[PDB]
Amino acid sequence: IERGSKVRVLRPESYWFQECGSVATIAKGGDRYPVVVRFEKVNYPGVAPNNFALDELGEVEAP
Amino acid sequence: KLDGTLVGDVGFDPLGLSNILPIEWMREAELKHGRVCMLAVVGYIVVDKGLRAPGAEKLVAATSSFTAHDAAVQSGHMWALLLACGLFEIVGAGAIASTLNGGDRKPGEFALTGGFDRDAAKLERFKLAEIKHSRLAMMAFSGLVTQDALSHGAT
Amino acid sequence: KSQALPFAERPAKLDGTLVGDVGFDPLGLSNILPIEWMREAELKHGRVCMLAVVGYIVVDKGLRAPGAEKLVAATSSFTAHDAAVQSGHMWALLLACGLFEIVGAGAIASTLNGGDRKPGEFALTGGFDRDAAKLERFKLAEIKHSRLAMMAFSGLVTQEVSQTLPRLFPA
Amino acid sequence: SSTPPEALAQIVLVLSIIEFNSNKDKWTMDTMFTDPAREPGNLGFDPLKF
Amino acid sequence: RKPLSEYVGASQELAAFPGGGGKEGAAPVPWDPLQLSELWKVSANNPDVAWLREAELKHGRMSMLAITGVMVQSAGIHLPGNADISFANADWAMAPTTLPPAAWGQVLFFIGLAEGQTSAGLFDLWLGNTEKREPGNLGWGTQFLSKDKKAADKMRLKELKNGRLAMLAIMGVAFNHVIPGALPGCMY
Amino acid sequence: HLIADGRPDHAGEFVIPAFGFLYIAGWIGWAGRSYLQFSKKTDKPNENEIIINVPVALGMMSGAFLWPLAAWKELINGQLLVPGDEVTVSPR
Numbered sequence A: 001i002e003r004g005s006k007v008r009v010l011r012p013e014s015y016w017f018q019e020c021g022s023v024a025t026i027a028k029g030g031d032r033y034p035v036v037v038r039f040e041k042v043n044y045p046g047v048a049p050n051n052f053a054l055d056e057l058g059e060v061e062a063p
Numbered sequence B: 001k002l003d004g005t006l007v008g009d010v011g012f013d014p015l016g017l018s019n020i021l022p023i024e025w026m027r028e029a030e031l032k033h034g035r036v037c038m039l040a041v042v043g044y045i046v047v048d049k050g051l052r053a054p055g056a057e058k059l060v061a062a063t064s065s066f067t068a069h070d071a072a073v074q075s076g077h078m079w080a081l082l083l084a085c086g087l088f089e090i091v092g093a094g095a096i097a098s099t100l101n102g103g104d105r106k107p108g109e110f111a112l113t114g115g116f117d118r119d120a121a122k123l124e125r126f127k128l129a130e131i132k133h134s135r136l137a138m139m140a141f142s143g144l145v146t147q148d149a150l151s152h153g154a155t
Numbered sequence C: 001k002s003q004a005l006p007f008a009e010r011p012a013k014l015d016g017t018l019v020g021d022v023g024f025d026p027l028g029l030s031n032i033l034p035i036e037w038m039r040e041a042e043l044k045h046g047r048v049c050m051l052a053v054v055g056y057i058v059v060d061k062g063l064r065a066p067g068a069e070k071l072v073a074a075t076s077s078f079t080a081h082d083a084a085v086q087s088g089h090m091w092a093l094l095l096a097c098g099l100f101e102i103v104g105a106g107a108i109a110s111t112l113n114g115g116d117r118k119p120g121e122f123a124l125t126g127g128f129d130r131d132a133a134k135l136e137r138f139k140l141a142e143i144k145h146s147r148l149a150m151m152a153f154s155g156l157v158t159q160e161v162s163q164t165l166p167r168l169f170p171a
Numbered sequence D: 001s002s003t004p005p006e007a008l009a010q011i012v013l014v015l016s017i018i019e020f021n022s023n024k025d026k027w028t029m030d031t032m033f034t035d036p037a038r039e040p041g042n043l044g045f046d047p048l049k050f
Numbered sequence E: 001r002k003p004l005s006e007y008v009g010a011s012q013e014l015a016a017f018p019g020g021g022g023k024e025g026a027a028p029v030p031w032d033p034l035q036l037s038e039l040w041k042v043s044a045n046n047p048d049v050a051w052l053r054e055a056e057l058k059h060g061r062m063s064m065l066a067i068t069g070v071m072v073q074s075a076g077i078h079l080p081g082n083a084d085i086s087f088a089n090a091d092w093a094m095a096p097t098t099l100p101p102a103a104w105g106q107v108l109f110f111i112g113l114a115e116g117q118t119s120a121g122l123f124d125l126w127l128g129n130t131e132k133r134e135p136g137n138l139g140w141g142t143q144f145l146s147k148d149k150k151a152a153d154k155m156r157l158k159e160l161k162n163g164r165l166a167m168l169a170i171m172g173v174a175f176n177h178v179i180p181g182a183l184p185g186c187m188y
Numbered sequence F: 001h002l003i004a005d006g007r008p009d010h011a012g013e014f015v016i017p018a019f020g021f022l023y024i025a026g027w028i029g030w031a032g033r034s035y036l037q038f039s040k041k042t043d044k045p046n047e048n049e050i051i052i053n054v055p056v057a058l059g060m061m062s063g064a065f066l067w068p069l070a071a072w073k074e075l076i077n078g079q080l081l082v083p084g085d086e087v088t089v090s091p092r
């Protein structure tokens, strides 16, 4: 996946499970959840983005 | 085949419908219609003669061949002829309608079904005569049905 | 390609393994059930009709069983069946035929479909076994007489009921 | 109200058929003028070619 | 799956207008206005076109047989009558009522046995998994039809057309005995 | 006493108002769904729902008169229903 990709979230406890989001930044380091995905729908706290791991995103559309 | 007779043509074909349904089935149906009509005209005139089949009763009563196919139906004689003709014609239905609009009609599209028992003549004059009398008896039996529905006797 | 119908193909599955195969299947009835069942049915029907023809033409001309008494069975084989149903002898005949049919028919039809033996042997050769040419000739004669006496018994019964049997053993 | 109602039913049915078929999928505002060649009011009914 | 285009059964008289024709079938796709054969794409509950073809072939065959029975029972031609059994009810739809249980119970029994024993692979349909079965291919008259492609397809199209007409007719003789007038020229 | 049986002689009862309401309710639902699709496809979906785009809303509202045909076309085309793996679901 790359920055600007459209991904589908596979984390079951996430608010955006099986929902589409846009990759914002992939950090290159020791981070356990490096990929930053921004969503168009806020969750119950009202937070739009979240940090996700590389195996929790299923990918939909290339940049 | 058979052309006019003394000129050479495909006969009178003004409608030209020989290029619509295949000529093999046309020739087979022509021969079957004609042979049916030949037996029909002979049986008609023989019943009008007074000749009787070996099975007696109700056959001389329903004479003139017009109450024949209204009283022999209820007498049960007509059903036996229907089923015998039906079984032979369903053997023919197999051997003929297995091939139509397609796969070859290599049985001689006429009288090729058996029949090589007594004569073994196989004359071309016999074939030409067979088709000619076939259609002559078609018109003859049409006349014998229609004229005798109002006239009687020999006309 | 056939022999009894030399104008319309040859029936499938009638290659000639069974005796007397002239390829007479215009309706193509050799596909509903296995040919071993059909040959077994033909042979059983033929044996029943040959015994039936013999019994009919022997009883009708006049012959009575040991102590067969005097009833409407003794009048003719026409009323013999309705006489012996009331006397209950047909129940004994049905019991004997049912016992032999259980053993013979169940074994004979169960094992051809499994695969084990010729269609209709019963192994009661009663003599001629060594002359296999005579075995196949007798198979052909058996099936020919089978068909002939199926026709013969049908004709006998229909002739007798068409005139209600006015005591005619030629009929 | 005087005329039979079946006459009106058949007339409205024929008009319904005519205007169902005269624009096969071109109903609604967003779907009719999607082609930039359909000028308004031109249903193609000009047999005499005026 | 088989996407309804190779299935024989399209009709010329639904392409009767200028444009489109043939021997007896319409060229640009067979008739399906409600797109009922495309309903397998959304949910597997909807049957495949193979199941629909088997259903209409069975309906058409039973309807030919039924309309022929209606045409023959309605005026004469009844089986000979013996003891404890009379085939005399010339009025259709009431003939099984005046009939002993050994006769009406035997038609249904043998119909059920033949239906159950020819039901091998109908549930391999409903999903497009033909392999065997091949819609209506019970075996009664296979290898009897022509071995080429055009004549066999013509024969099948003849079967489908006659069948559909019979369906519409047996349902015109019915719904007219129920309510008076669904067929103007009725005779029954 | 109204007979909601479905008999033809009592079709002036429930059945004919049933058909009328089903048509009108499908009209309302299809108009709402069409305007929802349009407002989703815009740049400010939230502001198009508290402040209605009245010309477009009237367009969908009047064009929802053929809802049983348009809904059937969308159902056959596969645009009416989400596959099911794309809608969010609780962990269970």
Ligand code: CLA
Residues within 6 Å of the ligand: C048, C049, C051, C052, C054, C055, C056, C058, C059, C063, C064, C065, C068, C073, C074, C076, C077, C080, C081, C084, C089, C090, C092, C093, C096, C097, C100
């Ligand atoms: C299809 C075969 C068949 C059938 C259905 C009948 C039926 C009948 N026969 Mg008959 N019969 C037959 C063949 C047949 N027969 C043959 C081939 C002959 C030799 C010519 C006879 C000679 C004959 C005479 C002489 C008389 C009858 C009589 C009768 C009647 C009463 C019989 C009775 O009480 O038996 C029920 C009682 C039994 C004890 C049953 C018999 C059991 C035997 C053994 C048969 C069992 C099966 C057998 C072993 C065959 C299996 C072969 C297998 C091993 C391959 C009845 C209508 C009598 C009658 O009333 O007529 C006026 C009579 O007088 N039959």
Ligand code: CLA
Residues within 6 Å of the ligand: E004, E005, E007, E008, E009, E010, E011, E014, E029, E030, E031, E032, E035, E036, E037, E038, E049, E052, E053, E055, E056, E059, E164, E165, E167, E168, E171
């Ligand atoms: C048992 C009924 C039945 C069934 C299952 C089919 C099935 C089929 N037909 Mg078919 N058809 C039928 C009856 C039927 N037909 C009748 C009676 C006619 C004559 C009007 C036709 C005329 C016809 C043509 C001309 C064509 C087809 C075609 C097809 C195939 C694709 C179309 C499709 O998906 O239809 C699915 C059909 C159904 C699921 C039947 C259910 C019907 C609805 C859903 C419920 C009942 C409504 C109905 C209006 C009932 C009111 C009363 C009624 C008696 C009038 C398919 C195999 C096409 C084809 O051959 O493709 C290769 C094609 O071109 N059909």
Ligand code: CLA
Residues within 6 Å of the ligand: F028, F029, F030, F031, F032, F033, F035, F052, F057, F058, F060, F061
């Ligand atoms: C046009 C919009 C629309 C549509 C198509 C639907 C469709 C549906 N709703 Mg629903 N709903 C809506 C608006 C809509 N809703 C709104 C605004 C609310 C909040 C009040 C709800 C609250 C709601 C609940 C609580 C439930 C449904 C359920 C359902 C389903 C069953 C039908 C039903 O119970 O209807 C009943 C619908 C209502 C009670 C609400 C109607 C409110 C108005 C009249 C509709 C809105 C029209 C809108 C303002 C038009 C503006 C567009 C214009 C600019 C063009 C169905 C999928 C049920 C379900 O899940 O079943 C599977 C269910 O339990 N809905």
Ligand SMILES: CCCCCC(=O)OC\C(C=C=C1C(C)(C)C[C@H](OC(C)=O)C[C@@]1(C)O)=C/C=C/C(C)=C/C=C/C=C(C)/C=C/C=C(\C)C(=O)C[C@@]12O[C@]1(C)C[C@@H](O)CC2(C)C
Residues within 6 Å of the ligand: B075, B076, B077, B079, B080, B083, C020, C143, C144, C145, C147, C148, C151
């Ligand atoms: C056709 C049946 C349906 C119709 C009924 C019927 O026919 O009527 C009955 C009827 C009389 C009558 C009627 C009335 C009562 C007077 C009045 C009725 O009026 C009503 C309805 O009230 C009408 C009618 C006509 O019914 C007359 C019917 C006569 C009929 C049906 C006659 C069949 C012989 C068969 C034979 C000789 C076979 C021999 C076959 C043989 C000998 C062989 O097996 C040879 C064999 O080589 C084979 C083939 C294979 C080989 O391996 C083996 C061998 C070598 C052995």
Ligand SMILES: CC(=O)O[C@H]1CC(C)(C)C(=C=C/C(C)=C/C=C/C(C)=C/C=C/C=C(C)/C=C/C=C(\C)C(=O)C[C@@]23O[C@]2(C)C[C@@H](O)CC3(C)C)[C@](C)(O)C1
Residues within 6 Å of the ligand: C086, C087, C088, C089, C091, C092
């Ligand atoms: C009133 C009316 O209308 O109806 C009437 C009609 C009618 C016909 C007149 C009537 C009658 C008479 C009937 C029904 C008579 C039926 C008679 C019947 C059926 C009698 C079975 C005997 C069984 C035997 C002999 C078994 C032997 C067994 C033997 C000999 C063995 O060796 C067995 C064996 O095991 C050993 C011992 C050692 C084993 O290693 C080997 C084997 C297995 C071989 C009735 C009753 O009156 C009714």
Ligand SMILES: CC1=C(C#C/C(C)=C/C=C/C(C)=C/C=C/C=C(C)/C=C/C=C(C)/C=C/[C@@]23O[C@]2(C)C[C@@H](O)CC3(C)C)C(C)(C)C[C@H](O)C1
Residues within 6 Å of the ligand: C050, C051, C053, C054, C124, C125, C126, C127, C145, C148, C149, C151, C152, C153, C155, C156, C159, C169, C170, C171
């Ligand atoms: C296998 C075996 C044995 C055996 C055996 C057996 C049982 C062999 C039996 C053979 C058998 C019993 C074969 C019958 C044929 C009947 C026919 C052909 C009928 C023809 C009848 C015809 C052709 C016509 C009849 C007619 O009625 C018609 C049609 C109309 C009437 O107007 C005129 C007449 C009446 C004439 C052994 C050796 C005994 C012991 C061994 O251990 C085991």
